[PDB]
């Protein structure tokens, strides 16, 4: 299957030239699932949050986008309470040129620029749009909860 080969290329890219503030590694049992971590960007309410993710790749990953979700609890307007992420990079209009490091960089950059319109978490977006202090307080709360795993 060509899907596993491009996954091996993705692993080779992430092993030696991983993006700053991002790490990833598949289970040595099978490459079909990945564990990735996005360190919260500086000058952001999500700063230093070691937010974890689980990457689920289909058997036709070169064309079918992966299933990306958040394991550590996240409070973001464009992140579901389930942990699912709505990104136009994901789901529809996903391009076959996306290295795993590119997806992780996209999600990391999504932190500082949420979309209050078309909310995925209605409470999160409403707090972000009108209630910046409460929103940043809750983001700090979820960051502290994220640190607890270790």
């Amino acid at each position: 299957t060509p899907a596993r080969r491009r996954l091996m290329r993705d692993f080779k890219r992430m092993k030696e030239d991983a993006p700053p503030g991002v790490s990833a590694s598949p289970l040595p049992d099978n490459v079909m699932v990945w564990n990735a971590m996005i360190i919260g960007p500086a000058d952001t309410p999500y700063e230093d949050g070691t937010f974890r993710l689980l990457l689920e790749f289909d058997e036709e990953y070169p064309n079918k986008p992966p299933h990306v979700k958040f394991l550590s609890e996240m409070f973001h307007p464009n992140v579901y309470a389930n942990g699912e992420i709505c990104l136009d990079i994901l789901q529809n209009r996903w391009t076959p040129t996306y290295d795993v490091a590119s997806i992780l960089t996209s999600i990391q950059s999504l932190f500082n620029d949420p979309n209050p319109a078309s909310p995925a978490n209605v409470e999160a977006a409403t707090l972000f749009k009108d209630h910046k202090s409460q929103y940043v307080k809750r983001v700090k709360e979820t960051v502290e909860k994220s640190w607890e795993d270790d």
């Binding site: 709505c86 078309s118 909310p119 995925a120």
Partner: peptide
């Protein structure tokens, strides 16, 4: 005068 006028008045997902």
């Amino acid at each position: 005068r006028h008045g997902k």
